[PDB]
A = this chain, B = another copy of it.
Amino acid sequence: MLPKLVITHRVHEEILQLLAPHCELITNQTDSTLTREEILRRCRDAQAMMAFMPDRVDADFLQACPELRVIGCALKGFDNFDVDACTARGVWLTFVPDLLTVPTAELAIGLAVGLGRHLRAADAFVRSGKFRGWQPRFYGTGLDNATVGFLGMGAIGLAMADRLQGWGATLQYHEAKALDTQTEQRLGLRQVACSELFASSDFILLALPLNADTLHLVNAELLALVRPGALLVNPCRGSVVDEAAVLAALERGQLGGYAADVFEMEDWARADRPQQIDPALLAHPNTLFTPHIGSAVRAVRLEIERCAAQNILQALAGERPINAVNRLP
């Protein structure tokens, strides 16, 4: 027989045909996400698992599945997966380090432009059949001669920076880990204090992970700093901002706009998460939203799927998985 691989969400059939001659598969080829108890059942005696953004794994889980050996995750942010427990149980935990970067970088830029140029309303105005030609309205904010501040300058921060090269903006960032001079210089990046980043940027592009330090980093106090009218764009994790503090900053018109691909309600790790995005936030005019689609480009998705599956075949064939997050003897 063969090792038992659970796959919690739908993948390309091509991936199944590469995984089949080495594993028996317990798939879920739908557009629906299966309940927490249902998954544990499926994994009970599974050796391998392919996990995705809705999946949530703690100490309890791992204990229910003692035949497990590898969780192959098809994502960058593993904040919903307890790596420490995985390590202590001899369980591999792999991620996808690079492939999510660019498609997310592209979307983030689009959201900056769309937010700045009032695109949701503009398009709604055209579709309302009342367009009778140009009128002096929808006056928005462009990138040319603006200060773009980045918070975090890892993969996505850098990818965004590369993409804003010919846009005539002034590029600054705040890192927890500074770059060398060759890169700062060659991207025209200028490092600043966090407070300073907020009080001076017209655009604020977030590119940091969710962890102990980053939860609600963007608070009521740091939002009191921004230039009245600045635009906040969040393509990383919801909980790095306080959405309630953001709503208020919007309502008093200190914050010119908020855009986001991610939300607090997605972050199952901290039980105290909001159960929804605030109706008042969704109803706000100065917003642009997408439903965690940063990596939803179909050629990439296939490559992401392929990578996560290779990690699994590597782990199961005995070997060390090229993209393992943790270390194992």
Which B residues touch A129, using CB under 8 A?
276-277, 279, 282
Interface hits, A286-314 → B, CB 8 Å: 288-293, 296-301
Docked Cα-Cα span, A164 to B109, in Å, equals 12
Residue of B whose beta carbon sits closest to that of A276:
B129
Q: How far is the CB of A166 from chain B (nearest CB, A)?
A: 4
Q: How far is the CB of A54 from chain B (nearest CB, A)?
A: 5
Assess whether A277 is in contact with B54, with CB atoms less than 8 Å apart.
Answer: no
Q: Which of B54, B114, B136 is in CB contact (< 8 Å) with A134?
A: B54
Docked Cα-Cα span, A300 to B143, in Å, equals 12
Q: Which of B106, B117, B127 is in CB contact (< 8 Å) with A107?
A: B117
Provide 30 A-B residue pairs closer than 8 Å at the C-beta atoms, listed in order of the A residue: A9-B135, A32-B135, A33-B134, A52-B134, A52-B136, A54-B134, A102-B168, A103-B142, A106-B167, A109-B109, A110-B119, A113-B113, A113-B114, A127-B282, A131-B277, A131-B291, A133-B266, A133-B292, A138-B293, A139-B297, A139-B301, A140-B298, A141-B297, A142-B297, A144-B297, A162-B166, A163-B167, A164-B166, A165-B165, A166-B166
Copies in the complex: 2
Which B residues touch A103, using CB under 8 A?
142, 144
In this complex, which of A117, A136, A137, A162 has the most chain B Cβ atoms within 10 angstroms of its Cβ?
Answer: A136
Q: Which of B31, B113, B276 is in CB contact (< 8 Å) with A136?
A: B31
A53 within 8 A of B: yes
Docked Cα-Cα span, A297 to B134, in Å, equals 14
Size range of the interface on A?
Answer: 35 or more
Q: How far is the CB of A262 from chain B (nearest CB, A)?
A: 9
Interface hits, A119-170 → B, CB 8 Å: 119-120, 122-123, 125-127, 129, 131-145, 162-168
Q: Which of B106, B133, B296 is in CB contact (< 8 Å) with A137?
A: B296
